[PDB]
Amino acid sequence: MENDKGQLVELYVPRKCSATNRIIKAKDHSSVQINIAQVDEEGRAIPGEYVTYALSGYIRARGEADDSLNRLAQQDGLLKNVWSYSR
Amino acid sequence: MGRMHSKGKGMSSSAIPYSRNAPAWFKGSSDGVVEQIIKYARKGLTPSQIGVLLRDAHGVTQAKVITGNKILRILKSNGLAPEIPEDLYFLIKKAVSVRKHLERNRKDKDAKFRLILIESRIHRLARYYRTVSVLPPNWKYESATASALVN
């Protein structure tokens, strides 16, 4: 990735699945990127400011997409106790 | 789930409790438990029946938990261990029973195969008890020796 002088020679350092840490292929035509809008004090969706989660196509095909999104949103303080860490 | 001499795959067993030490609710004495084991052995009972009697009629979960020694070990310390180990003796009894059933009716081939299986198991267990030197190195299994040991 790194040239000896210290400049990048890689192209498009790829994204990674936010739920399984696996990279997203360029032609991974099943993967999605969810955007959740930030909410201010009076419930007004602030425009242009949100939080993004890149869900891979593999987990979506398996069927763990919604559960992974539940956990990931609960961790960053979006949903209250929607997901329990102990099944 | 191996079933050495068949195609079975069961795992029915017993889970020994995590705590090795004595149960909190047990009030009996270890010396009394050893005396009970000695008396049961003198009655002419194998260690497994001794353990089952201590578990059912009394609060003894298991001898090693209460005393610190095993049932056969306790008997051996007092010199009551049988000259043939219990499992091998029961295999001998089963083999002689199937041989009796065979010599009383020849045409039953399934029991012949089962006798072959039992004899193979007897040979394996005898080999194990021979390398540990529980049995003398000349110990072996033929016809009319099983009857002599059983009777």
Next chain:
Amino acid sequence: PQAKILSQAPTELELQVAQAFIDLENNSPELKADLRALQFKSIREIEVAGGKKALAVFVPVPSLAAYHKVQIKLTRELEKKFQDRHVIFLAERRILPKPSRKSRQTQKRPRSRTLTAVHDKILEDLVFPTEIVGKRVRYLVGGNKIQKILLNSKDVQHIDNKLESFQAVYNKLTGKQIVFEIPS
């Protein structure tokens, strides 16, 4: 009778503990009739955080049986007499190194004299009134180990605050850190 209850060279601090044992022996109906046959193996002091201290009495081990039968009473009376010092009734066991192949044959080392077995017994006898019901071991990412001990929820009332000091003692004995957790 101060000297008889310690089979070790005298030390000023341990003489006071022996005198406290005589004062315990003063009470007849339950603190006598078993406590006469008592000894010691050089009780030692372990510093606890926050200025607290942990005295660790060292049984020769043949007396542990009696010591174990007596422990709860003697502990609470000693805590009454000894302030801020938590008393722990530890065993003393001979830890043997393994025969190096270049070392010479001595005898079959019994596994009870080994480091893990001795440490397991020490941690099990670090507290009588409660029993160890689970042992977990977690190796942190940074490369250090922790031995969680899960103790019975029943009989937890005896050890209300000694847990931390327990930790310290084990640490001071081993350097192997430890975290106590009580399951629900």
Next chain:
Amino acid sequence: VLVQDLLHPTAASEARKHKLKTLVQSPRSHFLDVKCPGCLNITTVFSHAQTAVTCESCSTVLCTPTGGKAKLSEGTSFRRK
């Protein structure tokens, strides 16, 4: 399912699973203190007993062997240990 605790699963799930399959394997059996209407002796018996347990004072059975656990003698009163 992708993220889940195995070190601390729910106790309901603990009773859900089979013995020999828990985190640490523990028996589901227990002991009982039975009293027979005959005398006042308290007898310690096993849940899954395998013998016709009787009080030493009277020749009256208190349990009965069964493919699973013990079936009592219709008149003995027990308390779980």
Next chain:
Amino acid sequence: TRTSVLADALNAINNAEKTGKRQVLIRPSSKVIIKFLQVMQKHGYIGEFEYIDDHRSGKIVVQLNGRLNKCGVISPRFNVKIADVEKWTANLLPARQFGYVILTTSAGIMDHEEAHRKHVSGKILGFVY
């Protein structure tokens, strides 16, 4: 029968990684498994594992973070002379810039680079990358 326990451990890790999980439950939990996972922790291919005492061989709970892609044992623990380490790395590791042939030397269970640093070599345990 269970012959090579470390094989079962690494196979379980591989299966629970390919499916996208973050944890494994390895049952038998010997010394060698502990040392192998400790090396993987040291090199980052694994997360935060755990030993669960049962008084019977214990167990291990392994936390993953998706960084690993394949474990694997070389089931016949071949005597690997110090000259043959490079051949094993070429045949097993995908690139020279990373990967680690975990091998057991007399100085303990170590990655191949550490063993080459000590200038000591022994039998081969497995490979991680």
Next chain:
RNA sequence: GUCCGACUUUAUGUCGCGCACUGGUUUUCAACCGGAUCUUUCCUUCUGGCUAACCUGUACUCCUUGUGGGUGCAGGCGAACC
């Protein structure tokens, strides 16, 4: 310290490659390997050598009143070695 590349028949003052040779390398650093030490933590140990070495204290102090430093003989350190 040593100094060399831009300044060209030369250099230093200069532009620093951020020192082309050699050190303080306890500047914290960070390792990468060892060695000895304390664990209830032994690495075969003695038996005479040889006592190498100072826990020896005998005659004592060369020199600033200073344990820096010693001429030295019975105990007595043996992995420093036979």
